């Protein structure tokens, strides 16, 4: 009952692309424009942020072919660094990174599926929450029934949103090269070359490329984890970078920086401006995007928790697998329950302030772990070893990305450190002490409840 490697190259490309291109390019490509205030330098910052994210993705290709173990930030931290920081990553990704991520993506799905019915005002909060919870439950059931159903949902919907972004880019280039070329005549004017603006420009050009390693969270289920993973990342990164640059070319050709910077739904404003009829195509597109980019944070997180239960940190339950269909049911139910719990909170969009120092700290610490491996143990079987230039420059970039939310948002990021650190009690009280030394009553009730949910969830431990 091993996890039954059933992911192809196209499915890996679909996961990565489907995890990067989300609501981060349709509702707010302003984080760069608001701190650059021009077109040419904004496109250059997009290109350069993309180049740095590509160097990072190549770092992770090297990693995910060296270790070949799921999680990509809980096994890579685990090996060569030890149990402690591994469990710290798993804790912050169980409390306020994966639940908040999926809850926000589902809430944006709800907001932009009914937006064509509620254009100018605020949709009823009740409908937002109920429809987002229904979307999460449907995606958890899909990913439970058959892993192939999850891969097919992800593939279909990343096809849909890539077609929508192709439509945007094509309309932008048509308007550009038809007769107008109106804003791209004296670009770079009014820009700000003082580091106090280009810093935040790049730092918000990186939060738009986050998600280029969803495929490394499930390295173990890939067909040929030594060839399909790096080839899949190398087929994804250029596609996402080119789509980002050309989509912003479309926006800046049709719309004006000001309105863009004002459009809470920049792509919706673009639809209203250029799509005379069929203005309800881009809201549908953002809805399909948030759906196919939720099934990439449920087909990649519920494997993180899986590796978690496998190494001994989380109860052995989350390691089970359905006998007849080979899908990690209990991990999926744990992730669905986490997301639905973190849907009760009003305004979860603020929780992007508590992990914007934890997520990138842990990506950077995985990179530091790769460098630690390269130095200490250079005799590993490495089916590809890229030049240390890539890990070192991406480590410097991640030092940038984890110091920026430490200068500003300092109280928030320190509460995020408090959240991540809150796991150390569970670690030093229940995890570190070995079996036969933990209390008999708690272990007995865990045995009873594991037997219960294992008989109910219809799952078994890996063999």
């Amino acid at each position: 009952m091993q996890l039954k490697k059933e992911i192809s190259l196209l499915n890996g490309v679909s996961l990565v692309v489907g995890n990067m291109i989300g609501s981060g390019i349709f509702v707010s490509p302003k984080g760069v424009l608001v701190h650059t205030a021009s077109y040419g330098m904004s496109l250059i910052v997009w290109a350069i942020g993309g180049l740095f994210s590509v160097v990072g993705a190549l770092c992770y290709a090297e990693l995910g072919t060296t270790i070949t173990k799921s999680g990509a930030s809980y096994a890579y931290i685990l090996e060569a660094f030890g149990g402690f920081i591994a469990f710290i990553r798993l804790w912050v990704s169980l409390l306020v990174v994966e639940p908040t991520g999926q809850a926000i993506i589902a809430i944006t799905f709800a907001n932009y599926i009914i937006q064509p019915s509620f254009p100018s005002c605020d949709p009823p909060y009740l409908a937002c929450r109920l429809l987002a919870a229904a979307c999460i439950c449907l995606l958890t059931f899909v990913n439970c029934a058959y892993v192939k159903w999850g891969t097919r949902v992800q593939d279909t919907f990343t096809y849909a949103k890539v077609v929508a972004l192709i439509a945007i880019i094509v309309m932008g280039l048509v308007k550009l090269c038809q007769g107008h070329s109106e804003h791209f005549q004296d670009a770079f004017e009014g820009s700000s070359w003082d580091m106090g603006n280009l810093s935040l420009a790049l730092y918000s050009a990186l939060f738009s490329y986050s998600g280029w390693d969803t495929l490394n969270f499930v390295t173990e289920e890939i067909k040929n984890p030594e060839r399909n993973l790096p080839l899949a990342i190398g087929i994804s990164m250029p596609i996402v970078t080119l789509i980002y640059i050309l989509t912003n070319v479309a926006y800046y050709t049709v719309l004006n920086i000001s309105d863009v910077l004002s459009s809470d739904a920049v792509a919706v404003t673009f639809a209203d401006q250029t799509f005379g009829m069929f203005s309800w195509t881009i809201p549908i597109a953002v809805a399909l995007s948030c759906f196919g980019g939720l099934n990439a944070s449920i087909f990649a997180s519920s494997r993180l928790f899986f590796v978690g239960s496998r190494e001994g940190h989380l109860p052995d339950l989350l390691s089970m697998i359905h006998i007849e269909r080979f899908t990690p049911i209990p991990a999926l139910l744990f992730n669905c329950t986490m997301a639905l719990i973190y849907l009760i909170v009003e305004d979860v969009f603020q929780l992007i302030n508590y992990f914007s120092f934890s997520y990138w700290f842990f990506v950077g610490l995985s990179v530091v772990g790769q460098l630690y491996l390269r130095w200490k143990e250079p005799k590993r079987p490495r089916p590809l070893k890229l030049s240390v230039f890539f890990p070192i420059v991406f480590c410097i970039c991640s030092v940038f990305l984890v110091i920026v939310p430490l200068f500003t948002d300092t109280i928030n990021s320190l509460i995020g450190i408090g959240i991540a650190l809150s796991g150390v009690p569970f670690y030093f009280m229940g995890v570190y002490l070995p079996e036969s030394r933990r209390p008999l009553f708690i272990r007995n009730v865990l045995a009873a409840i594991t037997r219960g949910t294992q008989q109910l969830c219809f799952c078994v431990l890996t063999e």
């Binding site: 100018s120 009823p124 439950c137 004006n256 594991t450 431990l461």
Partner: protein
């Protein structure tokens, strides 16, 4: 000890009828709860009320306007040309305006009508091509440009009183010529001086509307009574009519309340233009302690607010000695007026005021930011309710965007804002405690939701309270 049951049990003790029936029941209860979540979503989507339609306003609603009464007196000597002004479009867009009005740039000498035409650029200001480059740079920086077509702008009579038919022809062909050139509107002044005002002005309106629907024609009259306003505004309804209808005010709260409310009830809550005159400044009719008060009202009345050049700093035409009243000079820096230097203070130039939040230019920038970006001010409905003896209190609410409330102290003593309304619709439910975006007088902190009962209004203090969509 114990361990997860082997698949063997998963095959014997789990496949028992009881456990499989329980599992089927759990799954079916799940899908019942999920069809229930869908039913809830789909029913609550038809429970919240529909979303009102945006009136799809033109450009001249999306922000204030702005006049350049004379190109030369705006920046100063030497650079008093269109190409020189082309740099100031980085300054103007800091004020966050969505308009502009150049002065009459056609060649005009004096009463002589046979030589003065409305097409030839007066060469002392520049040429055609620099003008087109100015227009293109403006367009690029989201600032539409208007143009003044008052023919006899150098002379007492402005319409060439001798003749009326051929000047109409000059205006006729100049409209279409400059519109092909790329101007985004037109204005004329002293329409009460032009005989056959209503009909000729309606004809020019038809011209500028036939060329496009995002063009503008603004007529300015020195009138001060509402009756003249209506009598000229019967056949023309797309005509922002800037007049001295307000400037005659004695700054009495009840007087200005009656005045604005009567103007709106006479035009039936149409779209109007709020200014004190056709080209005069604010300070030419208002004391300096009253200016913040007015500029808080003009940026919140349901219309397009129309300021002359220099009324974003409080430029006075009488404070600086030896200054021409009709066309003062803007005060950029200490070197703005090289004559009798040293008297130019630091709080009187745009430079020294641009950094102080408790200045007047800061008030202008924050207001014109709250105007050109917030829905409920751009086109929201306007409803005034009574208040204390000498106050001015109203509410701006569109559908569900941030609902604004304004109150203004038109008195020289400490007034009390009673704020009893009892008459606004249910979509205008007053909160007992309301926010505060800014105040004409520094001393009340912004971001403090203040209760709507105990309010003591110091002399000439304005209030821009805010609250979200309440039910």
């Amino acid at each position: 000890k114990f361990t997860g049951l082997s698949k063997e049990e998963l095959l014997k003790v789990a496949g028992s009828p009881g456990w499989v029936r329980t599992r089927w029941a759990l799954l079916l209860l799940f899908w019942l709860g999920w069809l229930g979540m869908l039913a809830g979503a789909v029913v609550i989507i038809v429970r919240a009320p529909r979303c009102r339609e945006l009136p799809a306003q033109k450009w001249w609603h999306t922000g204030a306007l702005y006049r350049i009464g004379d190109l030369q007196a705006f920046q100063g000597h030497g650079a008093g040309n269109l190409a020189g002004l082309k740099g100031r479009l980085d300054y103007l867009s800091s004020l966050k305006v969505k308009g502009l009005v150049l002065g009459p740039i056609h060649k005009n000498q004096k009463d002589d009508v046979a030589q003065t035409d409305l097409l030839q650029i007066d060469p002392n200001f520049g040429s055609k091509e620099d003008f087109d480059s100015l227009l293109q740079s403006a367009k690029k920086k989201s600032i539409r440009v208007i143009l003044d077509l008052t023919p006899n702008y150098r002379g007492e009579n402005s319409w060439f009183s001798t003749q009326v038919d051929t000047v109409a022809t000059k205006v006729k062909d100049a409209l279409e010529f400059w519109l092909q050139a790329g101007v985004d509107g037109f204005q004329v002044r002293d329409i009460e001086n032009l005989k056959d005002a209503s009909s000729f002005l309606a004809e020019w309106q038809n011209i500028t509307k036939g060329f496009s629907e995002d063009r503008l024609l603004i007529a300015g009259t020195n009138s001060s009574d509402l009756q003249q306003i209506l009598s000229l505004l019967e056949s023309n309804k797309d005509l922002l009519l800037t007049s001295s209808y307000l400037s005659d005010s004695g700054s009495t709260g009840e007087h200005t309340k009656s005045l604005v409310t009567q103007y709106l009830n006479a035009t039936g809550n149409r779209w109007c233009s709020w200014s004190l005159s056709q080209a005069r400044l604010l300070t030419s009719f208002l004391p300096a302690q009253l200016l913040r008060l007015y500029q808080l009202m003009l940026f919140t009345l349901p219309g397009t607010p129309v300021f002359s050049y220099g009324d974003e700093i409080g430029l006075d035409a009488a404070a600086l000695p030896g200054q021409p009243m009709e066309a003062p000079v803007m005060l950029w820096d200490e070197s703005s007026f090289p004559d009798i230097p040293g008297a130019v203070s630091a709080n009187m130039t745009v430079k020294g005021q641009s950094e102080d939040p408790g200045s007047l230019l800061s008030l202008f920038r924050r207001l014109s930011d709250q105007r050109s970006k917030e829905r409920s001010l751009l086109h929201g409905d306007f409803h005034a309710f009574s208040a204390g003896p000498g106050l001015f209190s109203y509410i701006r609410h569109w559908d569900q965007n941030e609902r604004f409330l304004v109150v203004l102290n038109f008195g020289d003593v400490g007034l009390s804002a009673g704020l009893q309304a009892s008459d606004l619709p249910a979509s205008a439910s007053l909160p007992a405690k309301a926010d505060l975006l800014l105040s004409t007088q520094p001393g009340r902190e912004e971001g403090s939701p203040l209760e709507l009962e105990r309010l003591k209004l110091e002399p000439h203090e304005g209030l821009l309270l805010r609250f979200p969509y309440a039910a």
